[PDB]
Amino acid sequence: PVERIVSRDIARGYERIPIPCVNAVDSEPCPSNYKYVSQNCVTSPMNIDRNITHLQYCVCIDDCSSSNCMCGQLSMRCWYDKDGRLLPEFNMAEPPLIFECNHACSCWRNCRNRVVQNGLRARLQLYRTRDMGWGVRSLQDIPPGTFVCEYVGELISDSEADVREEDSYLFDLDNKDGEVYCIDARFYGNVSRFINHHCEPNLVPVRVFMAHQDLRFPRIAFFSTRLIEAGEQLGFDYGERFWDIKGKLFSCRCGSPKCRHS
């Protein structure tokens, strides 16, 4: 049916590569019931601790590949290799918190411990499936352990989340505490909001701290669990809380043997 380019860039140039939208299935236009934003935003205020003196920082004189780098130690160790990919020892079943370097450290902007703060770099594409509606695919091969994209959106309270109509776009940051917050990508979001569910996922979310270290508000970075080849769709485990509510209304269709919710 030929692939028509319905959008040249859904980000309007706000990323370092364009994210085009294409449709070779049906009649839907490029989605527009939302505002694309490349970084997290807020409506009602959040008291994010942006005190520069409250930041923990390293004092390294190298490229922050030493074991002495404080930011690596906060991360148990620096999990990035020279190419920006996670080392094989990284346990993607129970990922650790990643503390990248910040503006209070002594290192240079090109130190090893900086990956997510460099933005989205893979060439991705929003496309229409016959299956689950919209999905996101990669246009060239992605090696294992590469940072792909961040789950960005509007930061709200768990209270403000309970009183909003649709929950299909929430992502939860720490319920294992007292006060909890989430990211609602319904009204504002990025390309991550179109990433579909998968029972054998090629992406895992990791909690990362960069410019601040308010542990109430981590940022969600998706890394590749294996090699993603050109044309492969992306996806991640939406978690059992998605399905303990929305398995009532429909089935999953990741369409692969080891499915757990079809």
Ligand X SMILES: *CCC(=O)Nc1nc(NC2CCN(C(C)C)CC2)c2cc(OC)c(OCCCN3CCCC3)cc2n1
Ligand Y SMILES: C=CC(=O)Nc1nc(NC2CCN(C(C)C)CC2)c2cc(OC)c(OCCCN3CCCC3)cc2n1
Residue 161 touches ligand X, criterion: CB under 6 A = yes
Footprint on residues 183-212 left by Zn ion (CB under 5 A): 199
DSSP string covering 55-78, please?
Answer: ------SSSS-STT-HHHHHTSS-
How many angstroms separate the CA atoms of 189 and 170, rounded? 11
Q: 241 in helix, strand or coil? A: helix
Query: How far is residue 130 from each of residues 7, 49, 133, 136, 255, measured CA to CA in Å?
Result: 19, 45, 6, 13, 12
Asked if residue 101 belongs to a known ligand binding site, the reply is: yes
From the CB of 101, what's the least distance to ligand Y, in Å?
28
Q: Which region, left, alpha or beta, applies to residue 44 given φ > 0 means left and ψ of -120 to 50 means alpha?
A: beta
Nearer to a second copy, 187 or 243 (CB): 187
Q: Are 155 and 181 in contact (CB under 8 A)?
A: yes
Asked if residue 46 belongs to a known ligand binding site, the reply is: no
Structure tokens that stand for 222 in this block: 């998706």
DSSP-derived pairing of the beta strands 196-197 and 203-209? unpaired
Residue 116 touches Zn ion, criterion: CB under 5 A = no
Residue 67 touches a second copy, criterion: CB under 8 A = no
Asked if residue 41 belongs to a known ligand binding site, the reply is: no
Query: How far is residue 146 from each of residues 9, 96, 180, measured CA to CA in Å?
Result: 22, 16, 29
Nearer to a second copy, 216 or 253 (CB): 216
Closest to 112 in 3D by CA, of 58, 63, 173 = 63
Asked if residue 107 belongs to a known ligand binding site, the reply is: yes
Residue 187 touches ligand Y, criterion: CB under 6 A = no
Residue 38 touches a second copy, criterion: CB under 8 A = yes
Nearer to a second copy, 183 or 228 (CB): 183
Asked if residue 78 belongs to a known ligand binding site, the reply is: no
Residue 171 touches ligand Y, criterion: CB under 6 A = yes
Residue 242 touches ligand Y, criterion: CB under 6 A = yes
Nearer to ligand Y, 162 or 177 (CB): 162
Closest to 111 in 3D by CA, of 84, 89, 142, 90 = 84
Nearer to Zn ion, 123 or 246 (CB): 246
Q: Are 151 and 191 in contact (CB under 8 A)?
A: no
Residue 77 touches ligand Y, criterion: CB under 6 A = no
Residues found near ligand Y in the complex (CB under 6 A): 158, 161-162, 167-172, 180, 182, 238-239, 241-242, 245-246
Residues found near Zn ion in the complex (CB under 5 A): 58, 60, 64, 69, 71, 101, 105, 107, 111, 113, 199, 252, 254, 259
Q: Known binding site for S-adenosyl-L-methionine: residues? A: 132-134, 169, 196-197, 253
Residues found near ligand X in the complex (CB under 6 A): 158, 161-162, 164, 167-172, 180, 182, 238-239, 241-242, 245-246
